Design a protein around this motif. Sequence first.
Motif, mmCIF file in Angstrom:
data_model
loop_
_atom_site.group_PDB
_atom_site.id
_atom_site.type_symbol
_atom_site.label_atom_id
_atom_site.label_comp_id
_atom_site.label_asym_id
_atom_site.label_seq_id
_atom_site.Cartn_x
_atom_site.Cartn_y
_atom_site.Cartn_z
ATOM 1 N N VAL A 353 0.804 -1.396 0.118
ATOM 2 C CA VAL A 353 0.240 -0.050 0.271
ATOM 3 C C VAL A 353 0.983 1.194 0.008
ATOM 4 O O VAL A 353 0.513 2.189 -0.630
ATOM 5 C CB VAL A 353 -0.977 0.028 1.338
ATOM 6 N N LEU A 354 1.996 1.276 0.764
ATOM 7 C CA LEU A 354 2.952 2.330 0.527
ATOM 8 C C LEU A 354 3.128 2.702 -0.623
ATOM 9 O O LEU A 354 3.075 3.843 -1.166
ATOM 10 C CB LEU A 354 4.102 2.176 1.668
ATOM 11 N N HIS A 355 4.057 1.832 -1.421
ATOM 12 C CA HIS A 355 4.248 1.995 -2.881
ATOM 13 C C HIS A 355 3.445 2.603 -3.736
ATOM 14 O O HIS A 355 3.583 3.214 -4.572
ATOM 15 C CB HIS A 355 5.283 0.851 -3.315
ATOM 16 N N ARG A 373 -6.433 -2.108 -5.563
ATOM 17 C CA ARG A 373 -5.828 -3.207 -4.852
ATOM 18 C C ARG A 373 -5.358 -2.546 -3.470
ATOM 19 O O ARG A 373 -5.168 -3.497 -2.570
ATOM 20 C CB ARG A 373 -4.580 -3.411 -5.810
ATOM 21 N N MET A 374 -4.791 -1.530 -3.463
ATOM 22 C CA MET A 374 -4.226 -0.831 -2.036
ATOM 23 C C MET A 374 -5.506 -0.872 -1.205
ATOM 24 O O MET A 374 -5.361 -1.466 -0.133
ATOM 25 C CB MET A 374 -3.787 0.401 -2.268
ATOM 26 N N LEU A 375 -6.564 -0.322 -1.610
ATOM 27 C CA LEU A 375 -7.567 -0.362 -0.519
ATOM 28 C C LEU A 375 -8.369 -1.460 -0.158
ATOM 29 O O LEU A 375 -8.722 -1.864 0.860
ATOM 30 C CB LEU A 375 -8.867 0.547 -1.134
ATOM 31 N N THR A 376 -8.348 -2.688 -1.152
ATOM 32 C CA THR A 376 -8.663 -3.927 -1.101
ATOM 33 C C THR A 376 -7.746 -4.619 -0.133
ATOM 34 O O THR A 376 -8.388 -5.306 1.102
ATOM 35 C CB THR A 376 -8.784 -4.641 -2.421
ATOM 36 N N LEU A 377 -6.699 -4.478 -0.365
ATOM 37 C CA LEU A 377 -5.663 -5.057 0.823
ATOM 38 C C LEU A 377 -5.731 -4.581 2.240
ATOM 39 O O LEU A 377 -5.827 -5.307 3.141
ATOM 40 C CB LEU A 377 -4.047 -4.980 0.149
ATOM 41 N N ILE A 410 -1.732 4.496 5.007
ATOM 42 C CA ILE A 410 -3.265 4.906 4.603
ATOM 43 C C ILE A 410 -3.320 6.396 5.071
ATOM 44 O O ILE A 410 -3.672 7.012 4.114
ATOM 45 C CB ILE A 410 -4.212 4.111 4.911
ATOM 46 N N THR A 411 -3.173 6.929 6.328
ATOM 47 C CA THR A 411 -3.463 8.195 6.373
ATOM 48 C C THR A 411 -2.397 8.991 6.025
ATOM 49 O O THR A 411 -2.695 10.201 5.441
ATOM 50 C CB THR A 411 -3.324 8.430 8.112
ATOM 51 N N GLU A 412 -0.985 8.835 5.876
ATOM 52 C CA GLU A 412 -0.205 9.647 5.084
ATOM 53 C C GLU A 412 -0.679 9.796 3.677
ATOM 54 O O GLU A 412 -0.370 10.875 3.203
ATOM 55 C CB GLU A 412 1.124 9.041 5.335
ATOM 56 N N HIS A 413 -1.159 8.837 3.051
ATOM 57 C CA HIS A 413 -1.566 8.771 1.703
ATOM 58 C C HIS A 413 -2.916 9.874 1.644
ATOM 59 O O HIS A 413 -2.823 10.654 0.769
ATOM 60 C CB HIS A 413 -2.048 7.388 1.221
ATOM 61 N N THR A 414 -3.681 9.586 2.486
ATOM 62 C CA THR A 414 -4.910 10.323 2.444
ATOM 63 C C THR A 414 -4.345 11.912 2.608
ATOM 64 O O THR A 414 -5.137 12.596 2.178
ATOM 65 C CB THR A 414 -5.626 9.931 3.697
ATOM 66 N N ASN A 415 -3.459 11.974 3.381
ATOM 67 C CA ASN A 415 -2.943 13.607 3.456
ATOM 68 C C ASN A 415 -2.179 13.881 2.024
ATOM 69 O O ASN A 415 -2.420 14.968 1.694
ATOM 70 C CB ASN A 415 -1.936 13.650 4.563
ATOM 71 N N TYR A 416 -1.391 13.122 1.669
ATOM 72 C CA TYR A 416 -0.627 13.468 0.589
ATOM 73 C C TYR A 416 -1.184 13.471 -0.885
ATOM 74 O O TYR A 416 -1.338 14.415 -1.550
ATOM 75 C CB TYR A 416 0.810 12.365 0.279
ATOM 76 N N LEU A 417 -2.276 12.517 -0.795
ATOM 77 C CA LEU A 417 -2.929 12.246 -2.319
ATOM 78 C C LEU A 417 -4.061 13.290 -2.408
ATOM 79 O O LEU A 417 -4.602 13.898 -1.401
ATOM 80 C CB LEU A 417 -3.319 10.879 -2.456
ATOM 81 N N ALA A 418 -4.324 13.620 -3.686
ATOM 82 C CA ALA A 418 -5.469 14.277 -3.908
ATOM 83 C C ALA A 418 -6.784 13.559 -3.681
ATOM 84 O O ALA A 418 -6.882 12.535 -4.110
ATOM 85 C CB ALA A 418 -5.147 14.689 -5.555
ATOM 86 N N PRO A 419 -8.059 14.329 -3.291
ATOM 87 C CA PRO A 419 -9.014 13.780 -3.213
ATOM 88 C C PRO A 419 -9.706 12.999 -4.387
ATOM 89 O O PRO A 419 -10.355 12.031 -4.433
ATOM 90 C CB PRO A 419 -9.910 14.947 -2.719
ATOM 91 N N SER A 436 -15.749 -3.729 9.816
ATOM 92 C CA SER A 436 -15.808 -4.058 11.150
ATOM 93 C C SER A 436 -14.878 -3.239 12.046
ATOM 94 O O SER A 436 -15.367 -2.878 13.083
ATOM 95 C CB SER A 436 -15.762 -5.746 11.347
ATOM 96 N N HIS A 437 -13.681 -3.371 11.677
ATOM 97 C CA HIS A 437 -12.488 -2.911 12.612
ATOM 98 C C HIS A 437 -12.792 -1.314 12.523
ATOM 99 O O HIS A 437 -12.996 -0.517 11.583
ATOM 100 C CB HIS A 437 -11.225 -3.139 12.069
ATOM 101 N N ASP A 438 -12.700 -0.595 13.714
ATOM 102 C CA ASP A 438 -13.096 0.700 14.149
ATOM 103 C C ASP A 438 -11.919 1.555 13.486
ATOM 104 O O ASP A 438 -12.367 2.579 12.877
ATOM 105 C CB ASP A 438 -13.373 0.975 15.550
ATOM 106 N N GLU A 439 -10.739 1.346 13.939
ATOM 107 C CA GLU A 439 -9.780 2.243 13.379
ATOM 108 C C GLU A 439 -9.898 2.246 11.852
ATOM 109 O O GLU A 439 -9.537 3.358 11.078
ATOM 110 C CB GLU A 439 -8.316 1.908 13.781
ATOM 111 N N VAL A 440 -9.911 1.085 11.204
ATOM 112 C CA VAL A 440 -9.998 0.941 9.646
ATOM 113 C C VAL A 440 -11.085 1.977 8.949
ATOM 114 O O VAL A 440 -11.042 2.705 8.230
ATOM 115 C CB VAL A 440 -10.112 -0.346 9.355
ATOM 116 N N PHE A 441 -12.371 1.917 9.937
ATOM 117 C CA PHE A 441 -13.354 2.644 9.590
ATOM 118 C C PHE A 441 -12.993 4.196 9.753
ATOM 119 O O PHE A 441 -13.517 5.029 9.021
ATOM 120 C CB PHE A 441 -14.537 2.393 10.479
ATOM 121 N N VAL A 442 -12.278 4.568 10.562
ATOM 122 C CA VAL A 442 -11.928 5.941 10.659
ATOM 123 C C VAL A 442 -11.080 6.245 9.867
ATOM 124 O O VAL A 442 -11.298 7.531 9.130
ATOM 125 C CB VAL A 442 -10.980 6.239 12.286
#
Lengths: 462, 1335
Positions: A353-355, A373-377, A410-419, A436-442
Amino acid sequence: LGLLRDATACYDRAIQLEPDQIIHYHGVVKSMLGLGQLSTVITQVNGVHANRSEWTDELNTYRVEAAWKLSQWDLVENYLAADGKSTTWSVRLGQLLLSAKKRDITAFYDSLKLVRAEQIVPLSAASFERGSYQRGYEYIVRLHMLCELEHSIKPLFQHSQEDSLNWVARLEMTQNSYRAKEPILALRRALLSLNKRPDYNEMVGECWLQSARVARKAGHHQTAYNALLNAGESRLAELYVERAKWLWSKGDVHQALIVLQKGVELCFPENETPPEGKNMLIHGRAMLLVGRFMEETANFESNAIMKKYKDVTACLPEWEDGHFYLAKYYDKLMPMVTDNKMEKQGDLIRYIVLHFGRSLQYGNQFIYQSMPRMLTLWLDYGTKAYEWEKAGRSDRVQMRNDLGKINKVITEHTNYLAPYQFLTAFSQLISRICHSHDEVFVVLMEIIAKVFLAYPQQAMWM
Amino acid sequence: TDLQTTLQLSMKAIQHENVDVRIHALTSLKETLYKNQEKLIKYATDSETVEPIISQLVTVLLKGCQDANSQARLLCGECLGELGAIDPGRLDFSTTETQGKDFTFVTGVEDSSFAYGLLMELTRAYLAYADNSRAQDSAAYAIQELLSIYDCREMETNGPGHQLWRRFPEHVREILEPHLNTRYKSSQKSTDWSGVKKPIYLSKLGSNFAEWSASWAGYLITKVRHDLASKIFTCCSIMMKHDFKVTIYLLPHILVYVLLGCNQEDQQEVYAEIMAVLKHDDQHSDLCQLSTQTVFSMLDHLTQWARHKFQALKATVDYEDYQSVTRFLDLIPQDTLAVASFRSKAYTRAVMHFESFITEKKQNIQEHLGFLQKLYAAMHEPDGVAGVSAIRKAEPSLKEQILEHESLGLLRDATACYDRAIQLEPDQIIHYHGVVKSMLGLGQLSTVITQVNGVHANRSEWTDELNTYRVEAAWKLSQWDLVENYLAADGKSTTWSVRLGQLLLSAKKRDITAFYDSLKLVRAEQIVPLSAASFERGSYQRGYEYIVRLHMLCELEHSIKPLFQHSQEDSLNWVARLEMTQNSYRAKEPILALRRALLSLNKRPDYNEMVGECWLQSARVARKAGHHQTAYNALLNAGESRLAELYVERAKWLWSKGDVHQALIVLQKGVELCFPENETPPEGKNMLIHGRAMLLVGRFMEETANFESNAIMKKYKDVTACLPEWEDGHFYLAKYYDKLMPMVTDNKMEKQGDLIRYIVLHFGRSLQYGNQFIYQSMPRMLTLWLDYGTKAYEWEKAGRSDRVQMRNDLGKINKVITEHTNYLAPYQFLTAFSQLISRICHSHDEVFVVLMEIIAKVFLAYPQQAMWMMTAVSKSSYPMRVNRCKEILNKAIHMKKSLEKFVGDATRLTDKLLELCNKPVDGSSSTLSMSTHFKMLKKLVEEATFSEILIPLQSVMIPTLPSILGTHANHASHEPFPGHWAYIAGFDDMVEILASLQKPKKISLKGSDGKFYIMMCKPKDDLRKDCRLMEFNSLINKCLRKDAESRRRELHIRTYAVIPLNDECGIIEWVNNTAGLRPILTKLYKEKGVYMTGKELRQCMLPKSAALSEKLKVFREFLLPRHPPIFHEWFLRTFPDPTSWYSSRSAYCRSTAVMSMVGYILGLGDRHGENILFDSLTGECVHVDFNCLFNKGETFEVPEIVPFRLTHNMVNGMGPMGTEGLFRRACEVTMRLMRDQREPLMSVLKTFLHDPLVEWSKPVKGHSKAPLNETGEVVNEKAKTHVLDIEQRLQGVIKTRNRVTGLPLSIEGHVHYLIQEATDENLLCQMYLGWTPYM
Ligand SMILES: C[C@@H]1COCCN1c1cc([C@]2(O)C[C@H]3CC[C@@H](C2)O3)c2cnn(-c3cc[nH]n3)c2n1
C-alpha cells in the motif's frame, strides 16, 4: 488493410502478370517507401523511368518523398523540375522544404497557402459532422504538419522571432497511431535538417526513436527497426531501451534483456554516477524494464527482481512506474511467500500500500490498478485482524500492530494524495463503509470525507 | 547384375592408378547411374540412411574429384549429379578417409625418416629431370652426398643404412644403386651472400618464388653451424636452385638448424626475411602467397620441434636448443601471422594464430572482435559471427550489422541495413549487391530488375557486376529475351546464376554445341571448391552447395536433351531426387527454381500445373525452414494445382505463423470449394489431398479449445475411412483417443479397456502402413497393453467384480496385438525390443504368451541382436526373468531349430565373458593373458563349429528404419542393420586390466573381417540403464542427422554399445583414441610443472557443512589458480594441422554441447573428469558411466547443482569467445530439436523410466533381487516425477522455488540459463572435489 510489410510481393507478382499496369509499380515503391528503404525507392523509379519514360511523371512523387526525407535537396530539385503536374502531398511538402532551403520567402508562403487549401478541401466535404474530425484526422495532422513547418521555417527566413511550438507535447496530443505520428516525425526530421543547430544532429535520433516507439506500439516492427538504425548515429542509451522494447514486442524477452543489460553497463557503467537528470531518468527506465523482463523470465530469483525494482525507485523516487511495479511484485510474491496466510501478509501489505500510494502521489497512470488494490488489501487485512482478534488467535496482537502501521500509511496517503485520486474507487470506499474494524473505519471515514468536501454533489449521489 | 557388384567393380576402377582407366570407369559409371537410376533411388531413399554402397561411392567420388586430371574431376561430379545430392545425414561417412600424417617433428638431418624423405624427393627430382640433364646430374650429386652424409647402404650391417635402404621403395632403390656408388661433380657457383639484400623477398631474385626460396635456403645453409646439416644443405643446394619443391621440403630444417647455431644478428636476419614475407601483401605474382605458405610451414615445423624438444627436456644443451627455437617463435608476432593467413585465404590457421595471440599474449578480445568476425564470415562459420556479436560490448557498426545479417540470413533486416548503408556511403557497389540479393531471395524479381536498371542509369560501370541478379530474375521469370540482352552485356560474369542463364538460353535457342560446352564449363567451376573441400573431413556437407549445383546441372542436362533433336526423355524422378536432398531451403530452393525453369522451357501441357507444384514444394520448404515471407511469395506464384494442395499449404503456413484459427478457416474454405461435401472425390490424387486436409482440420480442431471432442474423433475417423492405407489418420486418431481416454475414463483403467483396444488397434494399423511414428506409436501401444494386463492381474487378484470385464477386454486387446504381430514386420518390434525384453516378467500369463510370440518373431528374424539384448534377462539373478527368457528362447527354437546351436553357443560365450569379467585380479598386474587364464573362452571361440556371433557394435544393434517416402510398402523385406556384419572369430592374446578401482578387464574381439574390435567388461555395475540410454542416444543421433542445422554443425551424441552380460557386468564397446579430461589435464599440468598433490587437495577441502562463501574463497584462491587453463594446449598438441585443429575444436564445442543438453534433459549426473572423454582424432566428447540419470545426483551426499559440466578448462578449449559462439548455438540447436521431437523422445523415455528390469533402486532391499517371490520387476517410484521433470526441461520450463509462478523459457534463454548455472563459480565450489570443478 495493410496485412504486413509483405504486400510488395503481391504487387510484384501482379507486375510479372501485367507489366504495363502502372498501379502496381505505384504500390511497390509505396511499400518500399513506408518500410524505410528510401534510397531504394529512388533507384526503383529511375529504373522504371528507363524502361518507360512516361510512367516517371506519376512516379516522380515517390522519388521526391524519398529525397527530402534523405535531405538530398539537390535531387529534390531535379525530381521537382522534371514534373510540375504532380500535386501529391509529398511533392508539395518537398517544394516547401526546398523553397525554405533555397530561401524563397514568397514562393514558400504561396505554396504554403496552396497546399493548406488543398488539405482543407477534403475536410470541407468531410466537415459534415458525423464523426468528421476522426474521418479527417489525416488531413488535420497535415495542417499540424504545415504549422510546425511554417514555424520552423520562419526563423530561417527572418535571419528575431523563433519557433515556439512545443514539438514534444504537440505529438502526444495526437492519436497514438503510426499513420498519424510518423508523417509529423519525418517532417520534423526534415525540418531539423533544413535548420542546422548543433543539437539538430541528435534531435534527429530522438525523432527516429519516437517513430520506432509509435511503430512498435502500432505493431509493425520492421519499420521500427529501420528507424532504430537511423537513430544510431546519435549517441543515446534510449536506443538500447527501445531496441529491447522492440524485441520484447517480438516476444524475445531474453534477447531483449540481454541487449538492455549490454546497454546499461555500457551507457551507465557502475563507476560514475548517472545523476544527469536525463541520464538518471533513462537509467531508471532501463532498470525498470530490466526488472520487468526478469519478472517474465523464470530463471531470475525473486529477491533480485525486488532489488532491481528498489534500485529503480531509489534512482527515481518521484517516478510512479517504479513504485507501482515494485508494489505489484510485492503483491505477486506475498501469497507465495506467506502461504496465502494473511497474518503473515501484514508487513508485505504495508510495503505494498505504501508504494502504491507513492505511485499515486507522482502520477495517475496506474490508478485503476493501484488505488483499488491498495484499498482492498487494507480493508481485507482489517477484516482479518478483527476476526483473529475476535477469535483470540495467537498472532492477533501482532496483526493489530501491523494493522496500525498500515492505517498510518493509509493516513499519510490520505494527506499526500489528492481527493480526486480517491474519487475513482469511491464506489469501492462507499462499499467497505460497514467495515468491522473501528480504526479502519476511521481511516476510511477521513478518506471519503476528504472526498466529500472536494466533490460533494458527486459524492452525495454515491 | 544386382548393381551392387557393378558399383563395387566400377569404384575400384575409379580409384585405379592409370588415368585413362579412371576415366573410362567414370564414364561407365555415368551411363550406369543413369540407366539404373530407379534402383539407386531405391537405395538412397528406401531407407532413412543411404545404403552402404552409396556412401562408399560418394566417398570414392569426392576423393576422385581431387583427381588431377580435369576430365576425371568432371566425370566425378557428373556421377555426383547422376547420383543426386543426397542428404549428408543419409550418408554414413563412418570412415570417410584416413589421411596419412607424419608422426613426428623429424629431429633433423640425423633422423632416418627425414633421410628417407630427402631420398624420395631426390629420386623424384632424378626421374623428373631426366628430361633436363643439368638438374638430374645435380640430383645425382645430391643423392650420393646424402648416401655419404649418413650411410644408406647396410653393407650387411643392422646400421642406419640398413633400415634406410629397406625404407626406400624398390623403384627408388633401382634408381639409387646405379648412382649410389658413382661420384658426381657439383656446379660450385658459390656466392658470398653479402651483396644480396638481406630481405631477399621482393628483390629481383626474390620476385621469383623458386628464386627467393633458393636464395634464402642458400643463405641459411651458410648460417648452418651443424656439420651434417651443412653437408645435407650443400648437397641439395643446386637441387634447391633447380627444384623449388626440394627447397620447400628442406627449408624448415635449415631454419631449425641455423636458429640453433645462429647469433642474435643471424636470428634477426632470418627474422627480417620471415617478417617481410608476412608483412607484404600485394604490390606494397604467386610469390607472396606461396612464400607465405612456405614460412608458415617453416614456423609450424619449428613449433612441432620445440614441443618435441620440450618433451625431451622434461624427459643441458637440448634445453638451450629448445630455448632458441622458443625465442624465435616468440619473436614473430602472432597478429601478423593471423593477418597473413587471412590475406593468404588460410582462415583456419589465422583463427589459430589469433586465438593464440589472445591467450598466449594476454589481450582484450573486444578490440579485435571485428577481425575475428571477418574471419568467421570468410570461414562461413555463422556461429562465430554470432558469438562475436554477443561477446561484443560496444554497439555494432553498420558494416558489422551487415555481416551479422549476411551470416544470419535475415533478408528483411539485411535489406534495411543495406539501404541505410547506401544512404551513409552511396558509392559502394557491395551495398547495392546486398539490396538486390535481398529483393531476389524474397522473390521480388521484377523489383530486382528495375533496381538494377536504375542503378545502371546512375552508374553504368556498376551494372556489369549487378547484371547477375538481373539475369537470375529473368531466367526465373522466363523472360528469355531479357536474359539474352543481359547476357550479351556481361562478357566475363562467371557467377552461378549467369552460367545457369546461359545454359537455359542455349536450350531456349536449341544451340546444342553451346549448351554442352557451357555445361562442361559450368560444371567444372563447381567441382573446384569440391576438390578443395574434399581434402577435409565432413567435406560432403561443406561442399553440399556445390554438390546440389551438380544435381541441378544433371537435372538440366537431362531435361534439355529431349528439347534438342531427341529414350532421350528425362527419366529422372524429380520428386525423389528432391526428397533425397537435405531438408533445407538453401538446398531445395535453387533446385526447384531450376526445375520450374526447365519446365517453362519444355512447355509441356501439364507443365503449367507442374510449375504450381514446384512453387508449392518451395513454399513447404521455406515453411519448414521458417522463411515465411518466401513461402508466401511462393503460395502466390502457385494456383494451378489448387485442388487443396494450395489451401492445405496456406493453412500450414498460417499454423506455423501461429494463426491456427485463420488456418482452420481457410482450410475449411478449401475443403468446401474443392472436395465438396456434395460430391465425393474418388481420384487418387484428390483423395490423398482430401485426407491430408481432413487430418489438418482435425489437428487444428484439437489445437483449438472451442471444438468438441466428438467432432475431432469424427474427423479423424473420416480420414481413416478415406485414406485407410495411410499411417497418419490412424496414428493421430489413436493419439487423440489416448489423450481423450483419461478424461473420458476419469483416469480409471476399467473404463479404459475398450478405448485402449481401439488405441492399440489404430497405433498398430499405422505401424502397418508406415514407420514415421515407430518411436511414438509402438512404445505407447505396448505400454497400454502391458499395463492393462498388469491392472487386470491386479484386479483378478484383488477379486473385484470389474476384474471379469477386464479379462474380456484384455482378451480383445490380446487378439488385436496378435493380429498386429502377424501383420507388422519384425523390425518394427525390434526398435522396441528392450521394452519387450523388459516386460518379459509380466504378471499376466496370456499377456506374456502374446509378448512371447512377439519376442520370438523378432528373434527368429534377428537372432544375434535379440540374444545380445536379452542375454541378461537369461543370466539375471531373479529366477522369474530367467524362466521367462528360457521359455522365449525355447519357443524360438521350436519355431526354428537353426536358432538352437547359435543360442547354446552364445550362452556359453556370454557365460565365459562374465567369468572373465567377474575375474579375481591377481593384484598388481597391468595385464592378464587370454591363453593363460581365459583359455576356455579362446577355445569356445576358436572352435570351427562355434556359431557366428556378432561383435555387438552400436551400428549393428541399432536398427535403420525405412523412409515414409519409400513407397510405404518397402517394409516387407526391408533390412535393418544394413552393412558389414562382423562376427566373434577370435579373442586377442592379451587382456588389459584398467587402473580403475572396479578393475575392469579390457579385451579385444577379433572380427571375422580380421579387424580387431575392443570391448571393455565393467565390474559390478548396472549397464542396462546405460544400454537403453544408448538406444535413446541413437534415436537422438537420428533426429540430428535428419535436421539440417544440426547436421551442418555435424552434431552427434557419440554412441557406443552397452551390453549387459548380467545384472552386474556388461561389455561396453570401446571408442578408440579416447582419453579422459582429468588424465589429459593432469598430464598437461605435469608438463607445465604446476600440480596439486592429494594432500594439498585434502587441505583445500572444506567440511561438507560450511559457508558457501568460504568454499568459494578456497576454490578461487587456491584451487583455480593452481589449475590454470591449458585445454587449448591439448588441442594444439594433438591437432598440429591448423585445419584439423579448427575442425576438432569446433567438434569439441558442438559435441559437448549436444551431450550437455542431452544430459540436462536426461538429468545426467556424475559427469566427473574421468567420465567425460575426448577423442584424440576428432575432438568429440564421449560420455560414460551413465549410472546417475534423472537427477539421481542431487540425491548424492554432495548434491549436484551443476546441470552439466562446463569448467574453465572445458571453456578454454572452446576458444577465447568461450561458451558464446559455436557451443552456445549448438546447445540452442539441439535443444530446439529435442523440443520439436519432444513427443518421440518422451515416448521412448517413459519406456525407460518405467523399465522394471533396470535396477532403479540400487540398495538391496534386504537382498530383494533374490527375495522376490514371483516378480522380476523393480518399480521406479520416482518414475512419474522424472517424466514430468524431463517434459518440463524439454518444454523450457524450470521449477523455481523463489515464490514465482513460472513461464516457459525460449531455447536461447534456456541455454543461457543452463550455461550460466553450469559455469557459475558459486555452484562449482559446492561440488565434491571428485568432479574436479577446478579442472
Ligand atoms: C569410452 C570409454 C572407453 O570406451 C568404453 C566406454 N568407456 C568407458 C570408460 C569408463 C572409464 O574409463 C571411466 C573412468 C576412468 C577409468 C574407469 C572407466 O572409470 C567407464 C565407466 N563407466 N563406463 C560405462 C558404463 C556404461 N557405459 N559406460 C565406462 N565406459
